[PDB]
Amino acid sequence: AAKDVKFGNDARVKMLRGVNVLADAVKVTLGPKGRNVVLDKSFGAPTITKDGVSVAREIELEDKFENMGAQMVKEVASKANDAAGDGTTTATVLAQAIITEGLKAVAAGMNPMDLKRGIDKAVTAAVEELKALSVPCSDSKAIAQVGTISANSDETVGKLIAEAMDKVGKEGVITVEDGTGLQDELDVVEGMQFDRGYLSPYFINKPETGAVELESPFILLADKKISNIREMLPVLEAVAKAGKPLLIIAEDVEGEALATLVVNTMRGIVKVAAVKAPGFGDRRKAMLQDIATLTGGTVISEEIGMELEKATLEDLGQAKRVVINKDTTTIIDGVGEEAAIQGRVAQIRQQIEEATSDYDREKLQERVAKLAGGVAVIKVGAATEVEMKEKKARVEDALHATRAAVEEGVVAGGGVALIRVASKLADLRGQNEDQNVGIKVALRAMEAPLRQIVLNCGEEPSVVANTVKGGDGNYGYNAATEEYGNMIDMGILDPTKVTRSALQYAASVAGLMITTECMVTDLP
Amino acid sequence: AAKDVKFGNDARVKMLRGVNVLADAVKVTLGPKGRNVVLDKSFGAPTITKDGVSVAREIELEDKFENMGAQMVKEVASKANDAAGDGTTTATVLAQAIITEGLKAVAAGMNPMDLKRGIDKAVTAAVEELKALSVPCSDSKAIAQVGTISANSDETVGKLIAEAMDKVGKEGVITVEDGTGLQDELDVVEGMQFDRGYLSPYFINKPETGAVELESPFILLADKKISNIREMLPVLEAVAKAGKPLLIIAEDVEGEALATLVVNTMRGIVKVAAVKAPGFGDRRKAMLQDIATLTGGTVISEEIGMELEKATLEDLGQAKRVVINKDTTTIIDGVGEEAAIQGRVAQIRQQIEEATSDYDREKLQERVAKLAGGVAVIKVGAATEVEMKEKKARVEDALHATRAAVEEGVVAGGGVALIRVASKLADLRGQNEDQNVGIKVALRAMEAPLRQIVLNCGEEPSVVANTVKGGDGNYGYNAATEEYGNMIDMGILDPTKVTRSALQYAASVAGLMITTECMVTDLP
Amino acid sequence: AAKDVKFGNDARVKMLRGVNVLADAVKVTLGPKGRNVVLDKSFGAPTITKDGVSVAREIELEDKFENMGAQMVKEVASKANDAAGDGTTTATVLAQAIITEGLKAVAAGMNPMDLKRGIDKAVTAAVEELKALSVPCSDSKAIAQVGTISANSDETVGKLIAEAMDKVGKEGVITVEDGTGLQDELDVVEGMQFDRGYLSPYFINKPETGAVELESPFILLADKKISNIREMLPVLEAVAKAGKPLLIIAEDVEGEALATLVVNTMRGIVKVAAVKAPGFGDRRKAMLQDIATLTGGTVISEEIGMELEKATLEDLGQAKRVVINKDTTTIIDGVGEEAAIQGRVAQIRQQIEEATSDYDREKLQERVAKLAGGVAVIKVGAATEVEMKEKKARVEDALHATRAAVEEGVVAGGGVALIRVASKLADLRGQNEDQNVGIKVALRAMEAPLRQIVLNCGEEPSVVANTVKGGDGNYGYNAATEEYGNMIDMGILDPTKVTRSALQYAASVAGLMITTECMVTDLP
Ligand SMILES: Nc1ncnc2c1ncn2[C@@H]1O[C@H](COP(=O)(O)OP(=O)(O)O)[C@@H](O)[C@H]1O
Ligand SMILES: Nc1ncnc2c1ncn2[C@@H]1O[C@H](COP(=O)(O)OP(=O)(O)O)[C@@H](O)[C@H]1O
Ligand SMILES: Nc1ncnc2c1ncn2[C@@H]1O[C@H](COP(=O)(O)OP(=O)(O)O)[C@@H](O)[C@H]1O
Ligand code: BEF
Ligand code: BEF
Ligand code: BEF
Ligand SMILES: [K+]
Ligand SMILES: [K+]
Ligand SMILES: [K+]
Ligand SMILES: [Mg+2]
Ligand SMILES: [Mg+2]
Ligand SMILES: [Mg+2]
């Protein structure tokens, strides 16, 4: 199709206009005194959000060159959300500041590539300084502070997240889902549990709770389909001689076998419960092997070279309790040696180290948690649906921030750490004068987040910026209280990883955006 | 698609305009002197309604920012209708008042988040005060008063609902359906009845009434499809030896078996009637087990491990009377031990405590009522169809309000209880001045429902408001007679749950709406 | 459909306008101080590129005659990219210069065909001069310099490419793919490796690394689907007698055979691994024969006249080590006589000499590299996706330029070699005055690339051009440092093939475009 071509300063002006539109929409949500943005939805009611990436993903402009600018700058927030899960608004603010200063430098006659090289050098030095400035975050009080700050200063969210992270451990998994009441609740499950219930309600022996309960059972792990009871007679006779319950986990069990088992259950010969194997395909085999290692049994598969009729008691696993209901089966205190379990989790860790997509990493981490740690679920409580969505977003942000802080440490919040780094980088020089101008551009842009935080509070950004720059260490400005003090003492903590990622992504996109000379897009 | 972005006060003004349009449409229907709204229908005649949620669901605006405001405020009425079934107009009025006062406070330079926090604190305190202010509603006179008030002061509706609730009991179910005459009628069914008639008109032994009547029969409950008569010969012979009728409840019965049964019926060997089992799938099995527990019999199923030919007299249930017609089968005075029925209803209650959707809860409640309570149907009478729909809506509103009042108690009506609570909360303070302003905003908005009720009557809302505030206790204004007096003595009662829910939902939505700074929507 | 027809000067003016639009878009990216062009994408974010052909392929104009001019001049860049992979911007600049000067000559009253003949003669003489002016490029320092220059002066890219070329050899293959980190990495694989993993995870004997490792195995190469183990019994017995592992490469292996093999593996009877044969169709057979020649075995096929049951130890290949994992199989140090390997690579070389499409040529090259050389992969590191794409394009350009420089030598860069050639051709004369004017047009156009390079730097092209023309040899202008000196000493090298190809293609298109008199296109 026919194209429209713009050259030089006209193209740069249109690009800056689009960048400014997107950044102005995003930046009103930054800090403890930021506000919400209402986003229209074609299907349903509008959503009200304080998240930078959610606002950024909805912005599209009528003018095509301004739209090109906005689409270019949207990638900063997208990448920050993908990487750290937090700090998208800060990244957008940094990108806009760099783009504006660099365009000013280009309009005065500077070489764009040298400016880009200077910006890259300054950002590398800043990343080194941030790494040197970090402190470990291991105590639960610091984790609670990080979660509170990341959830727009909500103490309950931070306390709940700290409790969940303490209970579940280091190898566990925490997820957030919608609740039903008005208060947040935490449900932590220890051991192995999968979303499979009994295949027949007649297996229930405790009708008061509507659940199947078995004490010290046998576990028959079959990686096959059981349809004819003839394959099951020998082991059934053996367990009847033993006199303890049996739990059969199979891919599926047919009607004749169900009828035989429910007949044998209530008649008193044997106590039997049957459920379906979790997962589909190779992952189902992996979960079956995990259960076998946990309970100390062996999976009966055709592909390995054994048949069901030849099974013995040694092949069956064992546990201490089994609780089954309509939806979930939990194995409690399965007898297994720590050597095999540790080997299995080490294998799954090595598998995690060689996987690409995040979904597969999440599934493997869930498996590791089921083997070694625990699983926690946080149910968010709210009166309405818009409130529920907003609070769920805040809780997820706090969860991501706590993970990042635990893995990489914390720095002073409120934009203070970036200012300290920029002050520490005041002697850095490049190869020529344009590279020095680029370094100065990056150092100036490093003060934008604090200025925006103060501007959102209704104060004067230049005065607060000068007062903070006059200090040293963790001295900073509390925007919620409007007071100066030690950032660490008042609990305004930022994870180091979030700050570093925001800086790197913003610089990477803005450096390329500065070097533009021509624009090609479709005609209106 | 391309987006339109508005910032700050322009966005807030447009949102307030949309909110005002929706609230102005809704509020004309509030109180004893509210009026009706005609809603156009694409398929058919227009509907005339006084319901707040019905009006709110139909409002959509041409301007997109005002439409976002209206769509946001619609959720209050939707949530109130879902929760209590009544009090949607009051919730909409409260939400509009909070939004207006909060936008005024924001325009003067207050921090929206602190205003929202103050509003939340005031609403929590108000909920506590309302709980402390409630009184029990157990007598039938108070229930009749509540039903009369909720049906727009219709004494016949309240009296009918009180009679139905007294006859049916605590565990029963009352439904409202269209009638045929000009008068409302109440039909109560005691015992077990399901919507299945006889499978052959030749079973009729009393052609005067066109129905099958059996005195002290046997009940054969088979969870299977009967096609060949050979399965049924032994029990038929045994019943013929016994000499009293038999009722066969099965999934279905084939033509050969029907022919054999109708041949044996009039020839005098045995008295037999056959009907289909109610329900489809698991619920059919649940109802079969319920009938088995009620009549003291056993269900003949293959999946449990028994066959029909091996049935004896023990497996057959017993009753005192069975009446069957074209459409319904009723079992009167089934012979069962109270322990089994109480256990079964306890199991179904525990199942109700673990259900999510309202349909499943309603079905379980109907089953519990069939086991223990009764079932009532109210047929509404009206000359035309618009009148029919209007009166049916009013009766449903009264039914929901009586349920809420029975479960949680009643307070003074006419907006008096909210005024008393706001007076009790006059000393509440927050953390800073913006939170105090938010508390004051909530307390001021708590007087809106009475002001709107009086304004609809054509009186002066400020004078009545001051006079009511000068009183104490249940002193209030009777808008129907234009007099002052004790609200409780005059029968103007509001359920506590409706008032509390309206307050909570209105606050939850309005607090978020106050904190908006930017709006993003599609271009016109 | 109806046509629009233009004659003479109007048509030539419109065509020149379209040429100028495309060339102005392209030329802003030329040289060390060129800038980037943002190209809009219908599906996704815009791409930022410094490549001439990428910009040229996106240009289409609303006016149909100008569009005809642009479409005509786009073929120069397309052909240069197809031929050398580099030098598209230089070719576009040369074509525009020739077109402009030739149109000026035509407008003064000269015969276009004689001008075209003079241009052709000058270009032939220039190609001869460039061939005489080239010097060999064999040392790694010169290759690194060429790669650095072609990657827009990135020393790391040039060093990495030189290392890869040294490690892999002359007959190897180097590819560029997306990385995951922020730094470029090089992975070189020696021997034969194909993208096939094991057919069963139970073959694994080293669970620590999750891989199958076999020391001094036998290799069974069969172009057949194995389903029944009965065909495989004799060779399995024989290798069990031998006592060394066996690797089975087949088209596919059925489930019964997998079960038998996995049962025999862990039981200590024999050590067996099985994978699928790489490729589909004739190429699969070629790869099987290549593996057979490498390992010294024979392929079992029905089409040659042998059966699997009759196989012996002589038919089985041998190797030193075999490593198999989820995705790749690697045969390390297969025992084979160099005579057969050399014959096979000579056969594939002769096949390469008689193939048309680039896909077949590159596949044959990969096969030759697997037989004799190595395979290297360069993973590009970048923070974002736009940066990733830009850097990947630069690395690919450097790779193509290094290949061209190795095969045909290098000349002075910066547009100096063309100027020297034009100076050497100052005595060339044609048959008549129009041909002399055409020769002068070509000689004048040969100075355009340096002028554009200097203009992009913000300097004065005429002054630099005169200063360079006043010199001799490799004297030139360094546009990065704004200094004069020896082109070769400061490492500004251009491959001879790229320069010659750009000149030839630009002349070929521009000569035809000069001779236009009438234009026929569709009505608007
Ligand atoms: N009380 C406070 N005083 C000063 N700065 C704060 C305070 N609370 C939070 N901040 C700062 O505000 C920022 C919060 O940004 P936020 O709105 O979450 O956007 P994002 O995290 O996506 O950049 C953090 O960098 C934090 O350092
Ligand atoms: N006679 C009366 N005098 C004063 N207030 C009344 C009288 N009758 C009803 N009301 C009040 O009017 C309100 C009923 O409003 P209604 O139109 O049913 O809307 P909603 O959907 O909010 O229930 C109740 O809060 C009740 O207290
Ligand atoms: N430092 C330098 N000084 C002068 N000329 C240079 C320098 N670096 C590169 N060049 C010249 O710039 C040209 C590179 O142009 P480029 O943008 O790659 O377009 P093309 O597609 O024609 O290769 C080469 O011909 C090279 O001779
Ligand atoms: F808006 Be940021 F991601 F907290
Ligand atoms: F109009 Be409300 F629901 F009584
Ligand atoms: F733009 Be050229 F192909 F380096
Ligand atoms: K934000
Ligand atoms: K109403
Ligand atoms: K270029
Ligand atoms: Mg955040
Ligand atoms: Mg009502
Ligand atoms: Mg190049």
Author numbering:
A (entry chain A), B (entry chain G), C (entry chain B): 2 to 525
Q: What do the study authors state?
A:
ATP-dependent binding of the lid-shaped GroES (a heptamer of 10 kDa subunits), capping the SP-containing ring (the cis-ring), results in the burial of hydrophobic surfaces on GroEL and displaces the bound protein into an enclosed chamber.
Encapsulation occurred following the addition of GroES and ATP-BeFx. For visualization of encapsulated SP, GroEL–GroES chambers were processed for cryo-EM structure determination.
